[PDB]
Write a protein that binds this ligand. Sequence first.
Ligand SMILES: *[C@@H]1O[C@H](CO)[C@@H](O[C@@H]2O[C@H](CO)[C@@H](O[C@H]3O[C@H](CO)[C@@H](O)[C@H](O[C@@]4(O)[C@H](O)[C@@H](O)O[C@H](CO)[C@H]4O)[C@@H]3O)[C@H](O)[C@H]2NC(C)=O)[C@H](O)[C@H]1NC(C)=O
Ligand SMILES: *[C@@H]1O[C@H](CO)[C@@H](O[C@@H]2O[C@H](CO)[C@@H](O)[C@H](O)[C@H]2NC(C)=O)[C@H](O)[C@H]1NC(C)=O
Ligand SMILES: *[C@@H]1O[C@H](CO)[C@@H](O[C@@H]2O[C@H](CO)[C@@H](O)[C@H](O)[C@H]2NC(C)=O)[C@H](O)[C@H]1NC(C)=O
Ligand SMILES: Nc1ncnc2c1ncn2[C@@H]1O[C@H](COP(=O)(O)OP(=O)(O)O)[C@@H](O)[C@H]1O
Ligand SMILES: *[C@@H]1O[C@H](CO)[C@@H](O)[C@H](O)[C@H]1NC(C)=O
Ligand code: ALF
Ligand SMILES: [Mg+2]
Ligand SMILES: [Mg+2]
Lengths: 910, 365
Amino acid sequence: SVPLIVIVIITAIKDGIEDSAGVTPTKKSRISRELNFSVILNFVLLFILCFTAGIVNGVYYKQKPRSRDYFEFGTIGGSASTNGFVSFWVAVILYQSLVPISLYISVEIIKTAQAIFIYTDVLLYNAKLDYPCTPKSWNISDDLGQIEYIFSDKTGTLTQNVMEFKKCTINGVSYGRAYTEALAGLRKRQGVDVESEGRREKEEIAKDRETMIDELRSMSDNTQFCPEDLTFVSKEIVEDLKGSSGDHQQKCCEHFLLALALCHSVLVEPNKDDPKKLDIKAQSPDESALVSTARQLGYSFVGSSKSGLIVEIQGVQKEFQVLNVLEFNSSRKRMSCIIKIPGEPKALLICKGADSVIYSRLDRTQNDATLLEKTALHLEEYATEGLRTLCLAQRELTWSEYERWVKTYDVAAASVTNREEELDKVTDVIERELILLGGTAIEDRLQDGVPDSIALLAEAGIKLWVLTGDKVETAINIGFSCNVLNNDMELLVVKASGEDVEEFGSDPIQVVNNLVTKYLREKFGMSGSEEELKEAKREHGLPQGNFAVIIDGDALKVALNGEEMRRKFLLLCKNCKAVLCCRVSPAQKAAVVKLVKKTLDVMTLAIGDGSNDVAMIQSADVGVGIAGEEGRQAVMCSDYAIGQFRYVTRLVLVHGKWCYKRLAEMIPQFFYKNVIFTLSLFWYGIYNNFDGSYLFEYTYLTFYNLAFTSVPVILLAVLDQDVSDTVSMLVPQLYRVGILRKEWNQTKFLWYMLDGVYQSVICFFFPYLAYHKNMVVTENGLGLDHRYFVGVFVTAIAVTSCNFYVFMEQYRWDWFCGLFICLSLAVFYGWTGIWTSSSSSNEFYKGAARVFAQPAYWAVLFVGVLFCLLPRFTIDCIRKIFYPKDIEIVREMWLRGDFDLYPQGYDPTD
Amino acid sequence: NRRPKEDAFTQQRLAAINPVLTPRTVLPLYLLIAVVFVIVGGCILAQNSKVDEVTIYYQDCMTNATSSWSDIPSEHWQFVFHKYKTYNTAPQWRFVDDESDDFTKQRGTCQIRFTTPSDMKNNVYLNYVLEKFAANHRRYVLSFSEDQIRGEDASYETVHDATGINCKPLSKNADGKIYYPCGLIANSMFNDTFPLQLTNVGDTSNNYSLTNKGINWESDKKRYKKTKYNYTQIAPPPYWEKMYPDGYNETNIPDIQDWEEFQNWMRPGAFDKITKLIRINKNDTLPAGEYQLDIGLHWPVLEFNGKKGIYLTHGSHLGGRNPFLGIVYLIGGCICAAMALILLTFWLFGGRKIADASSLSWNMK
Ligand SMILES: *[C@@H]1O[C@H](CO)[C@@H](O[C@@H]2O[C@H](CO)[C@@H](O[C@H]3O[C@H](CO)[C@@H](O)[C@H](O[C@@]4(O)[C@H](O)[C@@H](O)O[C@H](CO)[C@H]4O)[C@@H]3O)[C@H](O)[C@H]2NC(C)=O)[C@H](O)[C@H]1NC(C)=O
Ligand SMILES: *[C@@H]1O[C@H](CO)[C@@H](O[C@@H]2O[C@H](CO)[C@@H](O)[C@H](O)[C@H]2NC(C)=O)[C@H](O)[C@H]1NC(C)=O
Ligand SMILES: *[C@@H]1O[C@H](CO)[C@@H](O[C@@H]2O[C@H](CO)[C@@H](O)[C@H](O)[C@H]2NC(C)=O)[C@H](O)[C@H]1NC(C)=O
Ligand SMILES: Nc1ncnc2c1ncn2[C@@H]1O[C@H](COP(=O)(O)OP(=O)(O)O)[C@@H](O)[C@H]1O
Ligand SMILES: *[C@@H]1O[C@H](CO)[C@@H](O)[C@H](O)[C@H]1NC(C)=O
Ligand code: ALF
Ligand SMILES: [Mg+2]
Ligand SMILES: [Mg+2]
């Protein structure tokens, strides 16, 4: 009641001061349910113990009338009523010990302790961004060692939102030539020369920049001259501005440039030092890059004006305005701009987005069939060398069209009470006419230390999933630039589009069904509906069969409609490392995330950076946020946050595994350390017709499991270092222990239950047989000959045995654990020897002088500690000899001096 | 201002030592612990193999035979000495009756005669042993008062309707006067008298001196407090009517200052077997010879076949004759040595290099 609430408040205050309804935010983990099952097992063991006590406490009807009646003479009577009364209240007052008292709070005590130790990791501290790992939910952290699936949004996580201009498609002509790391990776994976050829390409690009700047200086003088800020290198388009490729080329190229400069949602602000200098910052990095490169090439957009744009061309100023704007929507995947220009007055509706959303709607009857093919090929190769596709489509509105647009706007503006649905439907139905005029090319840079980190995670035996919506070719190229997507694997692409429509063009459901049946029958063997799913859920995942699988938007959309489709998709997604999905909304991928979570449940990571990732984190086992784009708001609706992705390598692989092992080992230790205390009482109560003999002190109800020996178990739970961080990083194979769940099972529960029973047997029957013959061992005076003093013997044996046992299993003998072990024993001795010298020990009163001074005490604790530690230590040795696990093997080999040249806390980004 | 502090502790890099299980480290620790522990086990066994002991059961020395000197049945006397194996020397028992007591159920004096073949090392304890005495009944063991510690005399309500500990079963009588030694634990006291001296048939001019001063330490001396008995509300226990037919008067009050054995029975035995010290001799070296004791028979025990006897011993650094400690020491030494040799053989038989990278669970491919 009050004590629990006040201690919760005080520990929250301690958490707050050390950091600078209910508890669980949303849902618990599997460990909580397994703990509930284990506590139910403890409860039923207590209940059967009570039953086997109470049968004897009452079966004495046919037993001999011992001296239990020759002294009392108080025959109450009522065997059916009063004896049952005695039994029930004896049961309810003397069998309340096996139930865990502090475990229900100690679990989250340990969780918050290790979480705050996570929070204080200076190696998990960002330098540039300066955002360490800040936990939000202190409850769920044990799952971080059993992770076997990662869900990643490559918009901000895999690559930073630092845009770079490479090429641009104008009227089917590609302008822009350079050499990025992606091009070098493609060339080196194509088998062609890359060192001499790479240097030749670099010097050619340098010559192109030299001639571009020379021509720019010679022909005119621009307002954006700069020795280091210049990033424009394309020589083809700098000369193709006036008349290089004809007058029509000029008309189309400036028309495209004006259309693009009329299509953006970018905020432009002047620099504080120099107002003319551009400090363009906004929410859309791609549009910011587009306007920056427009400024560099000559279309300088300087100033902060929302009711119109002010742009200068080599000094010639011009002002305009965009009439209507429709920003990017999570479902639209595009931005719409409606402009109107007076004279021949004309309106222009321009839709900016990816290929899938733009090619979906257009004038089928009226198609150029020339610009369409050119743009399609342009974007195909752009995705091939990894250029993010940004295409724009134009729609002209004449005077009659403008008038009917105005009429439709003024007649559809009277809609209220969620008009958005009506507006979306009417715009979709009447917006069937579109014409494409081209697009641009932008590329993204990766994070720091991506390939090595993802490779060592892959070598750790864990599988990751990566998501996007743009397209597949850019996605696979980004994967190839890093080393997550190696060679020697073919693509299990299930696209319901492309060249496959030429020969087998039909509705997508049956074609994707045929191809997935092909994959499920003759590519991998899992043809079925029930047996294979159960086999997969029983096997609990394993990285094998290193291939790659690709899905398209339509197949994923229709996959949610079929039970057989979802089970077959779950079966086929058992690839080793590579899983890719595109053309899907965040709702659809959230649905597939919860699908893969429900069946064959496995802890899933939800790393993401954006706005579409919130659906990932809200429906996930555990999520980690990234402080990148405007979607950084996702971190509040998340579990953990970190400045950059490269840090999570240390989090899940190193610290999460330690969490999992420490918890899964210490919980069984806590269950072990409690059963003996009640079981000794059970054996002492066998006599007196099970009247309920209370062997221990009235004060031992609490201090045994609350003050004396509760320290080292939680100490090992929180302050354990299973292995050095460096060697774990170099050799992450030990993480398979979380993959195969080789430390959490009911067999361990029963094994430690039997171990506790046997330990209690030794602990009870050593001092008892030390007194069987004459119990006159005093060496002076009378002796002890009382239940409380033999209780002192047995509790001392039990506590020293448990403390040495958890000390034994403790993997890091340091200057910290042994000190508090010695302190726990010292305070036990001191309390037992001091509190006995008080009136509160009215009966006992003499522990120190009548027990400790006796050499029998030491003579019996010696045999107690040997018969406790030696059998299980020999079992440990024989298990480490005939079944040597990898952890002790790597421990001893690195201790021997093999891995000492490397320092501690080394990083690959140095 | 906001940068986290860098330290070994905040990163959990405190200095540590990680021992591993290798024969170069496993063997020496086993050999040293085994040799020292077997050595001390042999030492304690040698110490235990020296002390003597005699015990005689006399719970049924009132109808086993007549009032003559008859031999005690072998199921009652057990003798252990460090220089004799077949030292039978069957003790004799005799009974003498007295009609001065109305309680004819159990009365009279039981005299016993035993002998010792060797002298003693100036350290003699005499205890009374009880067998099958149920002192672990909750109502029995949770029936005593707290005021008797200080000699205070509270009201009947404070001792009858008190908390879980009180003199509930025998709180009140027909008179209503409370009991100073209330509670069944005190009311069920052993009721026998022991001689303060031991007769010596060899040389009667110097008998063997005994005392009942010093059974327990000064705890009771540090427990004694001034008392204020009202000498009018105190009534004898219902089982003490024969002891006090007239009840307590202003002279027969049970004092605690000197003869604490009246209350040394406060705490019961650990378990069914019951044994408490009744006679101590530190000054007089007991020589060999024949000796005789006399014991009253006031306490009834045959109503449920309970057993009662005497036990004379010497003690040691580890008490009296009980080879159980030596047994456990030898068992532990043998088990530890056997494990050490088993693993030594497995190292010889399974001779292989300790750190094998190919043995990892991921080196199959
Ligand atoms: C030695 O210490 C023992 C330990 O308590 C004493 O034994 C107890 O002796 C009393 C006295 O007789 C005895 O109390 C009851 O004994 C009879 C059956 O147990 C019972 O019939 C008897 O009742 C009367 O005799 C009384 O006059 C009175 O109660 O009225 C009834 C009816 O008229 C009458 O029969 C008496 O109440 C205890 O039972 C007995 N203890 C045990 C465990 O059996 C002993 O007295 C002590 N002796 C000395 C010299 O101190
Ligand atoms: C040693 O104890 C015996 C046992 O009582 C004493 O013997 C008694 O002696 C007195 C007088 O000497 C006689 O009146 C008794 O009849 C004797 N009793 C028995 C049972 O024989 C003996 O006196 C004691 N010796 C000493 C020195 O005190
Ligand atoms: C052993 O000797 C000691 C000391 O000579 C005895 O202790 C004395 O005992 C008497 C009677 O019991 C007391 O009046 C004295 O006050 C005690 N002296 C001290 C200093 O305490 C003891 O009784 C002897 N015991 C035996 C068995 O002979
Ligand atoms: N501000 C924007 N303006 C125009 N198009 C955008 C904008 N933001 C995103 N897009 C389009 O959406 C695609 C980005 O895909 P992705 O980031 O994976 O999904 P989402 O953007 O819906 O989270 C790009 O191909 C791009 O054409
Ligand atoms: C008190 O009673 C005891 C026995 O109970 C007796 O020996 C003594 O003489 C009595 N004394 C008085 C003054 O009544
Ligand atoms: F820049 Al975005 F979703 F529009 F990451
Ligand atoms: Mg975002
Ligand atoms: Mg949001």
